[PDB]
Amino acid sequence: MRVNITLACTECGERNYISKKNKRNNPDRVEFKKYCPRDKKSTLHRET
Amino acid sequence: NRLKEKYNKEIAPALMTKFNYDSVMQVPKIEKIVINMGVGDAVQNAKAIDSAVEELTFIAGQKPVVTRAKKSIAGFRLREGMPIGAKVTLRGERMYDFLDKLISVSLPRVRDFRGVSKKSFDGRGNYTLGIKEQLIFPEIDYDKVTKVRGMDIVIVTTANTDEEARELLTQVGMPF
Amino acid sequence: MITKTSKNAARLKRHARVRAKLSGTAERPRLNVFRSNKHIYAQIIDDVNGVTLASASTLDKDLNVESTGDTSAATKVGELVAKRAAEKGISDVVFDRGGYLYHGRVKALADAAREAGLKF
Amino acid sequence: MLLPKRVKYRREHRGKMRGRAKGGTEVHFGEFGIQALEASWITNRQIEAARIAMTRYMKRGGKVWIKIFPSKPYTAKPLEVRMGSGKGAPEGWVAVVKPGKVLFEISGVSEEVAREALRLASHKLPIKTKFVKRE
Amino acid sequence: SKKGVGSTKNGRDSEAKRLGAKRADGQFVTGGSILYRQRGTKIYPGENVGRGGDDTLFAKIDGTVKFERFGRDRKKVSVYPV
RNA sequence: GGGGCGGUCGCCUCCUAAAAGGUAACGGAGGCGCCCAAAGGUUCCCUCAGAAUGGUUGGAAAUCAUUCGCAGAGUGUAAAGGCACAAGGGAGCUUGACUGCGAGACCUACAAGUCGAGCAGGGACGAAAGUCGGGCUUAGUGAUCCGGUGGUUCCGCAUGGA
RNA sequence: AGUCUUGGAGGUAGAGCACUGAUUGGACUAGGGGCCCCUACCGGGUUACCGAAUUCAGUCAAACUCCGAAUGCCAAUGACU
RNA sequence: UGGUGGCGAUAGCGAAGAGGUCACACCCGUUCCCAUACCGAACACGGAAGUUAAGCUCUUCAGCGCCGAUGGUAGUCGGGGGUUUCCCCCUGUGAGAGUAGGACGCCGCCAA
RNA sequence: GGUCCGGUAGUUCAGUUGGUUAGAAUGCCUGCCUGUCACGCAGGAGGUCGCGGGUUCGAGUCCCGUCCGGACCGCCA
RNA sequence: GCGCGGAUAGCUCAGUCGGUAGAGCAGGGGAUUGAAAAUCCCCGUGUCCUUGGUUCGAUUCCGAGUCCGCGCA
């Protein structure tokens, strides 16, 4: 079943992205490399 | 290698005189020997194929390929996705190496032997053989074998009719 | 006899597959190669009119080399067709391999064209 | 009682019948046949009763043909209800006879007994009919 | 007296979407104008005309639309600038 | 098609629908309140289902080999449309299931909904051309108020803070 | 706006079997009855007794369509009103 | 004769027959790029022993597939009737499964 | 006439939900005990799921329809 | 008039792809016993209440008639 996830980043705290995930398929805290507007560059994002 | 030399020297000339071929490279040629393992798996034990793979890599010279089931059928409790059977194709000098072992040591070492089947053909020059025992060449470590499922042997030639393959396999060395 | 497809016949599908994505117009013409087992050809094609601009091959009447089918000949024919582009200069060309794989004598032709100066 | 052993959907529209028959206009298999010359519906009870009146009188004369199958169902609401609130349950099978269609074909039988027998079978049908023979 | 019947369980159908030609042959059109609203590739686009996210045909340049045959059976749509 | 009782109330697909669009009924048939870290994105490469014949455990079909085979098979899921120059299948890499947008265009009472070239920043894949702002398209979903959470170069009742 | 010319989109009436279903006979047999005997029918001989699969010929379909108008619809250009 | 294109297969599927000095392709062997969820048929690798057998190109044919109007009809716009769940007359318009036949290729561009 | 229930070994009830195993008493058969029978004690089989159709690798158990029973309702004049 | 239901051995009852008429009781005979019954075995002569289609074959698959029982604003 699918849960919303709000993405966060270490290289800057303020992050915004909403995605979905299955708790069976990805129990582990997922990571993604994305473009933050305020860092004005592509950064690696965790979620909360 | 020896069989390649004899095939180049005498086999192909004899049959090309016999069928009176205008172009000498219309000669039928054995193309591929493929060895296909099949396990009656159906989720009984994972280690059956996990033994047959390294048994067949000892029977042949290289590692086989775990075949993939196409579709699920519950008539064996066969779920699609879990592995069944193994396959390996042999060509090059390797095919003549294997056919060498076959004719030289293997069929004489079968527990009982009469002549190979007269009409196991496809109708279009291919041949299929079914053997019941893994005891092909004697330096398999026979004490390690547990299951008794033998092997499936498929020789494919460029023969278009059954008769040319039938005649050529005689001088290859298949008893009939 | 088992049905072995012609290699060229299989090649046409891949060449049409790549040609569906790209084609060589005026002032942006298409590079074209041939990788016959004995010879390597190169052609420059304009599509909107169905005409060829420049071409080259290993069996040209000059600069023949005992390779004639190897990567040295590929580089030589590539820079040959580079000056063939140069005299009636286009100075630009899109790439189109002929259903081949960009590793070998085709690649030799490619960077032959590159260092001889046809901007991709 | 010619049952279509399976049917795609069980309720179709009643449709409208305009013009002459699409095919099977003339005698094709037998020598003498019976043709209808105006449009109506035709149902399995009628077709069975007609085939009885034909064949039982005909006894050992020869063989018969039917080139009509009552494939199309027709429904009806149950008796004494207010109309509306869903289509009614189907209860029977019908076929369309466009004018020009041949109904039944007779075989292996001389002309005059077939004549009077088709005439006898005509009264079972609710339609005006015409005798046609093979060309 | 009455008899009680119900349960039709059929009375639903979606709101039907508008699909079809929204420009005619020979129309002057503008850049970004849709030409045909299909659902699945009924007509492959030709030159100066793209293919949308839900298989929509949109004119990339202002020009005149032409409808043509593509192959044996299929249609093609194109824009010719004037 | 008097009320009660029964059934239904939103969204998606086809027919009814009268060869543009639209078009009702307690008219006829189904589905939806998801799922997919890949069942995406790029690059590269293929090709089905079924049948015939041989082959053992093994067959009516488990796994091989040949031949025929436009599409009968798939296309996450209902139907419809379309798809074998893949939109079907397989492999590597990766996160474009990005931000700021947006010429115009459809549809519409309004609220809404939908497509969209191209531009800017920063990417991914590929050598490149070029593709990528999720799924092959159409369903998989709700106003406002009020409250929670995170960031704020905003205001904060004399001023400075709160 | 009307009309003439011309360009389109669109699958209805019609028609049709190429698909999907239905459906009729001829032929044919896989295979299910058919009793006998050897007997585990091992098979033979088995009634046209039924009867899959092909072909020949024929019949229907709103949710079948290899086709498919008349009209209506959307336009362009010129001409007239 | 090879390369690449546009044209609805009137381009095909078939059946037969010819060609190879050149070109094209079968072939030779994986050593080093590269590869075979197993393999040099496949990817590439670098040669040239013989081979038109196939691929490919030409020659023939209407078996299949395809294209195909003429006059007939079915339908239908508009009028007008009738005993009117449907038929009929007229100005137009023109069905497809049917044949007359067409076709077993047409036009380029560069390298002989 | 409408709605809702169930349709399982010979009988009575679980399983019918867990799509991926068909079970429990009783009955019946055999053996033991008893002089014999009954109790009592050891052993054992059975149904392949009302029917038909559809989905899926696979339905007793999912979804329709047919049949059999049972419950409820069939009201206002 | 309608919808049903049946009528099958002397009696009570079964009897669906049509696959060569069934059970229990009853009767008789045999077994058992000193005899008898209880018990066991064997022995059925079934126009399946009439009229048609079909079939190699029809309580059977039906059709409509006869008799009786079950419900009808």
mmCIF file of N, CA and C in Angstrom, chain C residues 5-85:
data_model
loop_
_atom_site.group_PDB
_atom_site.id
_atom_site.type_symbol
_atom_site.label_atom_id
_atom_site.label_comp_id
_atom_site.label_asym_id
_atom_site.label_seq_id
_atom_site.Cartn_x
_atom_site.Cartn_y
_atom_site.Cartn_z
ATOM 1 N N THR C 5 18.798 -15.931 -41.468
ATOM 2 C CA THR C 5 18.452 -14.696 -42.147
ATOM 3 C C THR C 5 19.689 -14.049 -42.752
ATOM 4 N N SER C 6 19.477 -13.317 -43.838
ATOM 5 C CA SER C 6 20.547 -12.509 -44.391
ATOM 6 C C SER C 6 20.896 -11.387 -43.430
ATOM 7 N N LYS C 7 22.197 -11.179 -43.241
ATOM 8 C CA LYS C 7 22.653 -10.140 -42.329
ATOM 9 C C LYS C 7 22.251 -8.759 -42.815
ATOM 10 N N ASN C 8 22.321 -8.527 -44.124
ATOM 11 C CA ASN C 8 21.858 -7.255 -44.663
ATOM 12 C C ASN C 8 20.366 -7.079 -44.440
ATOM 13 N N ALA C 9 19.593 -8.152 -44.606
ATOM 14 C CA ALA C 9 18.153 -8.074 -44.393
ATOM 15 C C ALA C 9 17.830 -7.736 -42.947
ATOM 16 N N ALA C 10 18.583 -8.302 -42.004
ATOM 17 C CA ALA C 10 18.415 -7.905 -40.612
ATOM 18 C C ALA C 10 18.884 -6.473 -40.391
ATOM 19 N N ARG C 11 19.892 -6.049 -41.149
ATOM 20 C CA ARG C 11 20.445 -4.710 -41.009
ATOM 21 C C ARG C 11 19.465 -3.640 -41.449
ATOM 22 N N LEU C 12 18.639 -3.942 -42.454
ATOM 23 C CA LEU C 12 17.684 -2.949 -42.942
ATOM 24 C C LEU C 12 16.704 -2.527 -41.862
ATOM 25 N N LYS C 13 16.297 -3.454 -40.992
ATOM 26 C CA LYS C 13 15.359 -3.078 -39.943
ATOM 27 C C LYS C 13 15.993 -2.092 -38.977
ATOM 28 N N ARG C 14 17.244 -2.335 -38.594
ATOM 29 C CA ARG C 14 17.906 -1.417 -37.678
ATOM 30 C C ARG C 14 18.201 -0.085 -38.354
ATOM 31 N N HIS C 15 18.521 -0.114 -39.650
ATOM 32 C CA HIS C 15 18.793 1.133 -40.357
ATOM 33 C C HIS C 15 17.529 1.962 -40.518
ATOM 34 N N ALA C 16 16.402 1.317 -40.811
ATOM 35 C CA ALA C 16 15.140 2.044 -40.866
ATOM 36 C C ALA C 16 14.735 2.531 -39.485
ATOM 37 N N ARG C 17 15.040 1.741 -38.455
ATOM 38 C CA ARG C 17 14.742 2.124 -37.082
ATOM 39 C C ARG C 17 15.475 3.395 -36.694
ATOM 40 N N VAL C 18 16.756 3.488 -37.040
ATOM 41 C CA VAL C 18 17.488 4.703 -36.708
ATOM 42 C C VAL C 18 17.102 5.836 -37.657
ATOM 43 N N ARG C 19 16.757 5.509 -38.906
ATOM 44 C CA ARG C 19 16.405 6.543 -39.871
ATOM 45 C C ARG C 19 15.041 7.147 -39.588
ATOM 46 N N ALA C 20 14.217 6.464 -38.794
ATOM 47 C CA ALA C 20 12.946 7.052 -38.398
ATOM 48 C C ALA C 20 13.148 8.250 -37.484
ATOM 49 N N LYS C 21 14.253 8.285 -36.745
ATOM 50 C CA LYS C 21 14.491 9.384 -35.823
ATOM 51 C C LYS C 21 15.249 10.542 -36.449
ATOM 52 N N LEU C 22 15.911 10.337 -37.585
ATOM 53 C CA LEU C 22 16.763 11.379 -38.136
ATOM 54 C C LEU C 22 16.895 11.237 -39.647
ATOM 55 N N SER C 23 17.159 12.367 -40.291
ATOM 56 C CA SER C 23 17.289 12.456 -41.738
ATOM 57 C C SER C 23 18.022 13.750 -42.060
ATOM 58 N N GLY C 24 18.704 13.763 -43.202
ATOM 59 C CA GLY C 24 19.631 14.843 -43.490
ATOM 60 C C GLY C 24 19.198 15.872 -44.513
ATOM 61 N N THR C 25 18.718 17.015 -44.037
ATOM 62 C CA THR C 25 18.159 18.040 -44.900
ATOM 63 C C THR C 25 19.261 18.910 -45.505
ATOM 64 N N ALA C 26 18.840 19.967 -46.203
ATOM 65 C CA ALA C 26 19.775 20.961 -46.710
ATOM 66 C C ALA C 26 20.495 21.627 -45.552
ATOM 67 N N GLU C 27 21.787 21.896 -45.758
ATOM 68 C CA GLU C 27 22.743 22.443 -44.779
ATOM 69 C C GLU C 27 22.781 21.655 -43.460
ATOM 70 N N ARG C 28 22.205 20.458 -43.432
ATOM 71 C CA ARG C 28 22.286 19.530 -42.313
ATOM 72 C C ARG C 28 22.189 18.116 -42.869
ATOM 73 N N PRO C 29 23.059 17.712 -43.813
ATOM 74 C CA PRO C 29 22.807 16.471 -44.551
ATOM 75 C C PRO C 29 23.141 15.251 -43.721
ATOM 76 N N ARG C 30 22.799 14.065 -44.203
ATOM 77 C CA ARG C 30 22.987 12.856 -43.421
ATOM 78 C C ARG C 30 24.273 12.171 -43.843
ATOM 79 N N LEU C 31 25.085 11.827 -42.858
ATOM 80 C CA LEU C 31 26.181 10.905 -43.066
ATOM 81 C C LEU C 31 25.618 9.518 -43.335
ATOM 82 N N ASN C 32 26.314 8.760 -44.171
ATOM 83 C CA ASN C 32 25.900 7.390 -44.417
ATOM 84 C C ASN C 32 27.127 6.542 -44.668
ATOM 85 N N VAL C 33 27.099 5.339 -44.115
ATOM 86 C CA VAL C 33 28.222 4.419 -44.192
ATOM 87 C C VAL C 33 27.749 3.132 -44.844
ATOM 88 N N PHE C 34 28.700 2.345 -45.328
ATOM 89 C CA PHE C 34 28.464 0.954 -45.674
ATOM 90 C C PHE C 34 29.631 0.146 -45.133
ATOM 91 N N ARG C 35 29.337 -1.029 -44.591
ATOM 92 C CA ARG C 35 30.360 -1.841 -43.952
ATOM 93 C C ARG C 35 30.358 -3.239 -44.547
ATOM 94 N N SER C 36 30.421 -3.314 -45.877
ATOM 95 C CA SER C 36 30.575 -4.576 -46.590
ATOM 96 C C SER C 36 31.806 -5.333 -46.112
ATOM 97 N N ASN C 37 31.784 -6.661 -46.241
ATOM 98 C CA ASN C 37 32.840 -7.483 -45.657
ATOM 99 C C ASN C 37 34.172 -7.302 -46.373
ATOM 100 N N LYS C 38 34.167 -6.673 -47.544
ATOM 101 C CA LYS C 38 35.390 -6.416 -48.279
ATOM 102 C C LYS C 38 35.690 -4.939 -48.462
ATOM 103 N N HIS C 39 34.716 -4.054 -48.264
ATOM 104 C CA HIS C 39 34.900 -2.648 -48.586
ATOM 105 C C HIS C 39 34.026 -1.786 -47.691
ATOM 106 N N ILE C 40 34.452 -0.537 -47.513
ATOM 107 C CA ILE C 40 33.749 0.442 -46.691
ATOM 108 C C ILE C 40 33.417 1.650 -47.550
ATOM 109 N N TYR C 41 32.138 1.998 -47.616
ATOM 110 C CA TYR C 41 31.682 3.132 -48.405
ATOM 111 C C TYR C 41 31.153 4.214 -47.479
ATOM 112 N N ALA C 42 31.236 5.454 -47.944
ATOM 113 C CA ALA C 42 30.671 6.595 -47.246
ATOM 114 C C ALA C 42 29.921 7.467 -48.240
ATOM 115 N N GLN C 43 28.754 7.957 -47.826
ATOM 116 C CA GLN C 43 27.902 8.742 -48.707
ATOM 117 C C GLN C 43 27.266 9.876 -47.914
ATOM 118 N N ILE C 44 27.031 11.001 -48.587
ATOM 119 C CA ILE C 44 26.347 12.158 -48.017
ATOM 120 C C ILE C 44 25.085 12.395 -48.833
ATOM 121 N N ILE C 45 23.935 12.429 -48.161
ATOM 122 C CA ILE C 45 22.627 12.404 -48.810
ATOM 123 C C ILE C 45 21.797 13.594 -48.353
ATOM 124 N N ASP C 46 21.165 14.260 -49.318
ATOM 125 C CA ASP C 46 20.104 15.224 -49.064
ATOM 126 C C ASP C 46 18.779 14.535 -49.369
ATOM 127 N N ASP C 47 17.845 14.620 -48.424
ATOM 128 C CA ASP C 47 16.648 13.784 -48.462
ATOM 129 C C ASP C 47 15.483 14.492 -49.143
ATOM 130 N N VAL C 48 15.382 15.811 -48.963
ATOM 131 C CA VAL C 48 14.219 16.552 -49.450
ATOM 132 C C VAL C 48 14.196 16.601 -50.973
ATOM 133 N N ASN C 49 15.316 16.281 -51.606
ATOM 134 C CA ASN C 49 15.397 16.238 -53.054
ATOM 135 C C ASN C 49 15.827 14.876 -53.569
ATOM 136 N N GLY C 50 16.272 13.993 -52.681
ATOM 137 C CA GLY C 50 16.753 12.683 -53.074
ATOM 138 C C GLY C 50 18.030 12.710 -53.884
ATOM 139 N N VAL C 51 18.995 13.533 -53.483
ATOM 140 C CA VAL C 51 20.250 13.675 -54.206
ATOM 141 C C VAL C 51 21.398 13.450 -53.233
ATOM 142 N N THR C 52 22.556 13.092 -53.775
ATOM 143 C CA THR C 52 23.739 12.940 -52.949
ATOM 144 C C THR C 52 24.711 14.091 -53.194
ATOM 145 N N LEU C 53 25.333 14.555 -52.112
ATOM 146 C CA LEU C 53 26.244 15.691 -52.164
ATOM 147 C C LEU C 53 27.680 15.246 -52.397
ATOM 148 N N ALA C 54 28.177 14.327 -51.577
ATOM 149 C CA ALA C 54 29.535 13.832 -51.709
ATOM 150 C C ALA C 54 29.559 12.377 -51.272
ATOM 151 N N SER C 55 30.573 11.652 -51.732
ATOM 152 C CA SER C 55 30.689 10.240 -51.413
ATOM 153 C C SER C 55 32.139 9.805 -51.536
ATOM 154 N N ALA C 56 32.439 8.664 -50.922
ATOM 155 C CA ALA C 56 33.776 8.091 -50.945
ATOM 156 C C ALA C 56 33.669 6.597 -50.679
ATOM 157 N N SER C 57 34.753 5.879 -50.953
ATOM 158 C CA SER C 57 34.771 4.437 -50.769
ATOM 159 C C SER C 57 36.210 3.964 -50.664
ATOM 160 N N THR C 58 36.380 2.713 -50.231
ATOM 161 C CA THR C 58 37.718 2.133 -50.210
ATOM 162 C C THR C 58 38.206 1.832 -51.617
ATOM 163 N N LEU C 59 37.293 1.511 -52.533
ATOM 164 C CA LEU C 59 37.689 1.155 -53.887
ATOM 165 C C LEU C 59 37.808 2.370 -54.796
ATOM 166 N N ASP C 60 38.073 3.542 -54.224
ATOM 167 C CA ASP C 60 38.437 4.714 -55.000
ATOM 168 C C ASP C 60 39.731 4.463 -55.766
ATOM 169 N N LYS C 61 39.857 5.131 -56.913
ATOM 170 C CA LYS C 61 40.952 4.911 -57.851
ATOM 171 C C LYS C 61 42.288 5.454 -57.353
ATOM 172 N N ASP C 62 42.333 6.003 -56.144
ATOM 173 C CA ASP C 62 43.551 6.563 -55.589
ATOM 174 C C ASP C 62 43.597 6.237 -54.100
ATOM 175 N N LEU C 63 44.771 6.476 -53.505
ATOM 176 C CA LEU C 63 45.093 6.188 -52.095
ATOM 177 C C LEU C 63 44.697 4.773 -51.673
ATOM 178 N N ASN C 64 44.822 3.812 -52.585
ATOM 179 C CA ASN C 64 44.511 2.437 -52.236
ATOM 180 C C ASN C 64 45.559 1.888 -51.272
ATOM 181 N N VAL C 65 45.076 1.160 -50.270
ATOM 182 C CA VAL C 65 45.905 0.659 -49.185
ATOM 183 C C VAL C 65 45.566 -0.817 -49.019
ATOM 184 N N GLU C 66 46.593 -1.622 -48.716
ATOM 185 C CA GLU C 66 46.435 -3.072 -48.599
ATOM 186 C C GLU C 66 45.488 -3.482 -47.479
ATOM 187 N N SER C 67 45.175 -2.570 -46.560
ATOM 188 C CA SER C 67 44.080 -2.741 -45.618
ATOM 189 C C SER C 67 42.765 -3.025 -46.328
ATOM 190 N N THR C 68 42.271 -2.023 -47.066
ATOM 191 C CA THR C 68 41.017 -2.012 -47.844
ATOM 192 C C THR C 68 39.908 -2.837 -47.189
ATOM 193 N N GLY C 69 39.539 -2.426 -45.981
ATOM 194 C CA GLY C 69 38.618 -3.220 -45.195
ATOM 195 C C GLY C 69 38.944 -3.194 -43.719
ATOM 196 N N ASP C 70 39.966 -2.432 -43.354
ATOM 197 C CA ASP C 70 40.372 -2.294 -41.968
ATOM 198 C C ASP C 70 40.254 -0.834 -41.525
ATOM 199 N N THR C 71 40.540 -0.601 -40.238
ATOM 200 C CA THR C 71 40.244 0.687 -39.614
ATOM 201 C C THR C 71 41.137 1.796 -40.152
ATOM 202 N N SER C 72 42.334 1.446 -40.625
ATOM 203 C CA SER C 72 43.180 2.429 -41.291
ATOM 204 C C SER C 72 42.507 2.952 -42.553
ATOM 205 N N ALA C 73 41.959 2.039 -43.358
ATOM 206 C CA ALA C 73 41.209 2.448 -44.537
ATOM 207 C C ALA C 73 39.949 3.199 -44.143
ATOM 208 N N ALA C 74 39.365 2.847 -42.997
ATOM 209 C CA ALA C 74 38.181 3.555 -42.524
ATOM 210 C C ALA C 74 38.497 5.007 -42.198
ATOM 211 N N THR C 75 39.601 5.244 -41.492
ATOM 212 C CA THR C 75 40.022 6.611 -41.198
ATOM 213 C C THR C 75 40.355 7.370 -42.475
ATOM 214 N N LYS C 76 41.021 6.701 -43.414
ATOM 215 C CA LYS C 76 41.410 7.381 -44.641
ATOM 216 C C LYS C 76 40.189 7.744 -45.479
ATOM 217 N N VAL C 77 39.218 6.836 -45.583
ATOM 218 C CA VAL C 77 38.022 7.158 -46.352
ATOM 219 C C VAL C 77 37.172 8.192 -45.623
ATOM 220 N N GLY C 78 37.225 8.218 -44.287
ATOM 221 C CA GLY C 78 36.503 9.240 -43.548
ATOM 222 C C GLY C 78 37.041 10.632 -43.810
ATOM 223 N N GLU C 79 38.362 10.787 -43.773
ATOM 224 C CA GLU C 79 38.883 12.124 -44.030
ATOM 225 C C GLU C 79 38.859 12.451 -45.524
ATOM 226 N N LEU C 80 38.821 11.424 -46.385
ATOM 227 C CA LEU C 80 38.574 11.641 -47.810
ATOM 228 C C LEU C 80 37.209 12.278 -48.024
ATOM 229 N N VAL C 81 36.169 11.692 -47.425
ATOM 230 C CA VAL C 81 34.841 12.261 -47.613
ATOM 231 C C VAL C 81 34.706 13.558 -46.820
ATOM 232 N N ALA C 82 35.594 13.792 -45.850
ATOM 233 C CA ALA C 82 35.633 15.097 -45.201
ATOM 234 C C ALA C 82 36.077 16.190 -46.171
ATOM 235 N N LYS C 83 37.143 15.954 -46.953
ATOM 236 C CA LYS C 83 37.455 16.985 -47.952
ATOM 237 C C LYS C 83 36.437 17.008 -49.085
ATOM 238 N N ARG C 84 35.825 15.860 -49.405
ATOM 239 C CA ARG C 84 34.716 15.894 -50.360
ATOM 240 C C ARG C 84 33.571 16.764 -49.871
ATOM 241 N N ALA C 85 33.332 16.794 -48.567
ATOM 242 C CA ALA C 85 32.425 17.794 -48.031
ATOM 243 C C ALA C 85 33.029 19.187 -48.109
#
